[PDB]
Amino acid sequence: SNKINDALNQHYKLNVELGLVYAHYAHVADDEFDMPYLGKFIQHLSEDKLGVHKEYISDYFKRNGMKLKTDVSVAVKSIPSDAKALIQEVYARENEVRDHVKAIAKLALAEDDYESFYFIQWYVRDGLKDLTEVDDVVKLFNSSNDKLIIEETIKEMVE
Amino acid sequence: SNKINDALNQHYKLNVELGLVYAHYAHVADDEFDMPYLGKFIQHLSEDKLGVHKEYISDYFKRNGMKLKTDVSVAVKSIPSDAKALIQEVYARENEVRDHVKAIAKLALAEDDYESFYFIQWYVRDGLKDLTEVDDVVKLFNSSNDKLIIEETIKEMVE
Amino acid sequence: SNKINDALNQHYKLNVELGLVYAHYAHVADDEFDMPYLGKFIQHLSEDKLGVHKEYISDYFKRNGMKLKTDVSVAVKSIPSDAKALIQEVYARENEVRDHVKAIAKLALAEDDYESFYFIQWYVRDGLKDLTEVDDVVKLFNSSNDKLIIEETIKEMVE
Amino acid sequence: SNKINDALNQHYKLNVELGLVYAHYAHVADDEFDMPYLGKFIQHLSEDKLGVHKEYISDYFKRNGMKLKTDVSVAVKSIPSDAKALIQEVYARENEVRDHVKAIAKLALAEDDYESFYFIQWYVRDGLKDLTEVDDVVKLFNSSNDKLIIEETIKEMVE
Amino acid sequence: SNKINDALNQHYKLNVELGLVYAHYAHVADDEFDMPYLGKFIQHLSEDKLGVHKEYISDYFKRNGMKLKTDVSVAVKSIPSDAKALIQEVYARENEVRDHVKAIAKLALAEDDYESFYFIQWYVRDGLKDLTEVDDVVKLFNSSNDKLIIEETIKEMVE
Amino acid sequence: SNKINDALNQHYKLNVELGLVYAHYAHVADDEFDMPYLGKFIQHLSEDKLGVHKEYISDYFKRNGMKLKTDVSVAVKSIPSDAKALIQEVYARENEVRDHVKAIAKLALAEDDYESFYFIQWYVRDGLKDLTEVDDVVKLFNSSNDKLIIEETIKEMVE
Ligand SMILES: [Cl-]
Ligand SMILES: [Cl-]
Ligand SMILES: [Cl-]
Ligand SMILES: [Cl-]
Ligand SMILES: [Cl-]
Ligand SMILES: [Cl-]
Ligand SMILES: [Fe+3]
Ligand SMILES: [Fe+3]
Ligand SMILES: [Fe+3]
Ligand SMILES: [Fe+3]
Ligand SMILES: [Fe+3]
Ligand SMILES: [Fe+3]
Ligand SMILES: [Fe+3]
Ligand SMILES: [Fe+3]
Ligand SMILES: [Fe+3]
Ligand SMILES: [Fe+3]
Ligand SMILES: [Fe+3]
Ligand SMILES: [Fe+3]
Ligand SMILES: [Fe+3]
Ligand SMILES: [Fe+3]
Ligand SMILES: [Fe+3]
Ligand SMILES: [Fe+3]
Ligand SMILES: [Fe+3]
Ligand SMILES: [Fe+3]
């Protein structure tokens, strides 16, 4: 399906662009906000998006004959003002990923593309786990007013 | 130094953009040219550029107080016509990286930035090894007319 | 070079005098400020300066024929008022060390003393790592108002 | 006791200043007198004085409430003329240490400071062992006219 | 750079020619001067110069595109008269190597050849260690009048 | 025997000069002809000639009282045009070595020098094995038109 090919190419672009934004946010968490474990948490998200998250699509295209497109444009022009806002922004972007992944599943059933429906199954499930891990971190900031206490808790999540 | 900060931000951008191009070329080597080990060779170059090659700069900025900029724009709009041309293009881009890395070293001595001169030392040395590994592969294509013989030789270089 | 010999003798004196000051500060961190892990952190800096930091120079002189001078004068006549100020003072002295080490590198190139330029390379690189470790500790004091939380974090840095 | 506090601060100063002198003598033994094992023997004495010898006092002050003073002034302005003279000078300084340590013990009993009397017990005993080890080396120079034979014997004492 | 290519070809020639001279001196140390451990010490220097010392240059040329020249002319037409003189001559030749290596470093910075500057860094550092090891042996001959005592000491340096 | 001494000194010179030529040929095999395993094969021949092949003679002289002469002159002024020609030239030089070694054996029996006859026995036997190993490689070039197939076969001979 051309429409599935386009939607998965769009998802490839999103994984790349968010990975590059997260790499920036991870640097800022450590460098500006004094939170190196928040930085490590966000760096692992960055490495996933620039790693297996994009390679699964590229490899899927190799098997079903679809075409890969590389077209990337992203600039980090402002930064959230503090660390809570930073992880809140990460969360908002991970929810956008959920919406897109669900749209792809719906479209695959529409087009009777059961290979793509089964392929996208991993994203549906795994992305919900990624979103809850991110949500847990956001909340640390409502459970403690102390940045070093929050860091200690995050340390167990990047373990 | 502002000028060193700018040049290292430019080198960060180059590592990112080439990493994304190499990821595309690795896919094409396997998918279109039937050369999965050429694909693996090019994928390892992609993973280096999107990995430690960019993280060393970002981490260096954290120590000396420089500012990181994320501004990325790259589109793969044409593909070399066969596998020799593909690895020849990779080689040409790796030589552009050599030129930039040398310009940074020269500028660091000019500015009496001995921390940056010592930091760039790794790129000078390592990039020469990366360029010779790439040059070895290009040459396989002049040593054999058989794609499966070349693949077998490449297999020992991605080992 | 006489001028390099003088500058490295001055750096030997600085390492000795700061080592003795840091030994005092480490005692005060534990004894007056109730922070024994801050004390241990500062004691390891003291042991480096009175240990390998000075022995590398002395050993370097043995190989290139330079002359060692021992002329030491230091008195600790006032103490910073609290623990944050104490580690802030440590940081200010470590930046003075960076400035001197860079001056030596510049002078070695001027004099075409490539042995000394290569010998000072370790100080340039390593001193930047020491300065960032110290800067991390200073910041704990902006990330937490609780001395026992900061101690727990420092414990992982003296590990 | 103020008088014990002063005498132990004086002993701290002596350990520091002799440690710095011994570090110089160790360098000269190797560099000028061609005796690197004599150098190693004297370096271990230097490391003791700048290490545990001074840290025991500093740590003792932490327990009994005394105050530490850092006030150091030492310059190495002449060097003994040959290696026998060098180790003979070391011996003379180690005897001065014996005299001071004994004065502290006598004063502690006078002041009914039984904690300090018991604390100084280690210095009384250990310093006698250090003085006999040094005396053994001095004598090598009366038992052999050959510097390489003496070095071989010293090698077993720095083992 | 042609001038760097020429200077490194000259350094390749020097390593070869000195290696052949040292091989002769090692034979003479054992055969004529009854000092087989002095012979072994000098043989290891010979094997370094005819081994990695020359192969590093040859391999460096392979990576940066320079041209290797083999043009060798050396004759051992006289021999130092005793063993001290023999190791003194070795020392004089190792100092000539230091001078040439430094000239290459200076020229590389002049030509903005930062690859060659970084490549020559090993020679600058390592050659200073080789020169001090050789200087230690020369001195044995001033520390003992007995050839079998000196041999025993050398035995620990060829270990 | 003076005549045996001269012939073994000539054989020492030949081993040295061929070793230096082979070192050049090994570099060219890899650098110009894209055959790094041919290069490794030729490098091992180079290391033998500059190593044990010459040290056996030098050590033999030490036992029977003969005199060693070092007089070396060799320049590589042209290179065979392709890789087959290169290994063919190596073969021709190894046959010259066979002729000289046989002349020495004949002369030793003439002079009733049974020590030299027995000493040269190793060269007679071993040099025939070296010549057949070289001949096997030459032939690869008649058994395959593909340089990467030949390389793979050579890989098992440098194993
Ligand atoms: Cl389907
Ligand atoms: Cl600097
Ligand atoms: Cl130099
Ligand atoms: Cl008491
Ligand atoms: Cl360069
Ligand atoms: Cl015989
Ligand atoms: Fe920080
Ligand atoms: Fe994951
Ligand atoms: Fe349907
Ligand atoms: Fe395929
Ligand atoms: Fe790498
Ligand atoms: Fe300058
Ligand atoms: Fe306390
Ligand atoms: Fe350190
Ligand atoms: Fe200059
Ligand atoms: Fe010495
Ligand atoms: Fe002791
Ligand atoms: Fe009493
Ligand atoms: Fe002998
Ligand atoms: Fe070496
Ligand atoms: Fe310049
Ligand atoms: Fe090549
Ligand atoms: Fe052999
Ligand atoms: Fe006969």
**Separation between Cα atoms, residue F69 and residue F9, nearest integer Å:** 6
Closest C-alpha among C90, C95, C67, C94 to residue C79: C90
Residues with CB under 5 Å of ion ligand 6 are: F 114-115
Are E132 and E157 contacting, i.e. CB atoms less than 8 angstroms apart?
no
Helix F114-143 with F147-155: angle, nearest 10 deg: 140
Length of chain B: 159
Number of H helices, E strands in chain B: 6, 1
**Separation between Cα atoms, residue E75 and residue E78, nearest integer Å:** 9
Are C91 and C131 contacting, i.e. CB atoms less than 8 angstroms apart?
yes
Length of chain F: 159
> Could you tell me the distance, in angstroms and rounded to a whole number, from the CA of residue D60 to the centre of ligand 10?
75
Where is D71: in which H helix or E strand? strand D71-75
- The tokens describing F103, both together, are 């002349």
Read off φ and ψ for residue D82, nearest 5 degrees.
-150, 180
Are B159 and B152 contacting, i.e. CB atoms less than 8 angstroms apart?
no
Contacts of B among chains (3+ CB pairs under 8 A): A, C, E, F
Radius of gyration of chain D (CA): 17
For residue E47, count other CB atoms closer than 10 A to its CB: 18
**Separation between Cα atoms, residue A80 and residue B138, nearest integer Å:** 46
- The tokens describing F153, both together, are 């076969």
Length of chain D: 159
What b-and-e string marks burial along D67-89, b requiring 16 or more CB atoms within 10 Å of the CB?
A: ebbbebebebeeeeeebbebbbe
Nearest CA in chain E to C119: E125
Length of chain E: 159
Angle at F44 between CA F43 and CA F48, to 5 degrees: 115
**Separation between Cα atoms, residue B144 and residue B138, nearest integer Å:** 11
The shortest C-alpha distance from E116 to chain C (Å) reads 14
DSSP per position, B120-137: HHHHHHHHHHHHHHHHHH
**Separation between Cα atoms, residue A9 and residue A70, nearest integer Å:** 8
Testing the interface with C: which of D25, D56, D68, D78 to mutate, by most C Cβ within 10 A? D68
> Could you tell me the distance, in angstroms and rounded to a whole number, from the CA of residue D36 to the centre of ligand 16?
7
SS3 per residue for B3-53? HHHHHHHHHHHHHHHHHHHHHHHHHHHHHCCCCHHHHHHHHHHHHHHHCHH
Length of chain A: 159
Q: Count CA atoms closer than 13 A to C57's CA, side-chain side.
A: 28
**Separation between Cα atoms, residue B16 and residue C111, nearest integer Å:** 40
Are D148 and E144 contacting, i.e. CB atoms less than 8 angstroms apart?
yes
Give residues with Cβ within 8 angstroms of C5, minimum separation 6: C61, C66, C67
Are E18 and E111 contacting, i.e. CB atoms less than 8 angstroms apart?
no
Are E86 and E150 contacting, i.e. CB atoms less than 8 angstroms apart?
no
Sign of CA dihedral C68, C69, C75, C81: negative
Set of chain B residues whose Cβ sits within 8 Å of the Cβ of E105? none
**Separation between Cα atoms, residue D79 and residue E111, nearest integer Å:** 46
Tell the residue number behind the tokens 């030596």, with chain if given.
C104
Torsion of CA A103, A107, A108, A112, to 10 degrees: 160
Q: Where does C4-116 show beta strands of DSSP type E?
A: 71-75
Are B10 and B70 contacting, i.e. CB atoms less than 8 angstroms apart?
no
Closest C-alpha among D138, D50, D142 to residue D89: D138
SS3 at position F68: coil
Closest C-alpha among E60, E47, E49 to residue E4: E60
What b-and-e string marks burial along C47-74, b requiring 16 or more CB atoms within 10 Å of the CB?
A: bbbbbebbbbbbebbbbbebebbbebeb
Where is C13: in which H helix or E strand? helix C2-31
Set of chain C residues whose Cβ sits within 8 Å of the Cβ of E106? 112, 114
Give residues with Cβ within 8 angstroms of D105, minimum separation 6: D117, D120, D121, D124
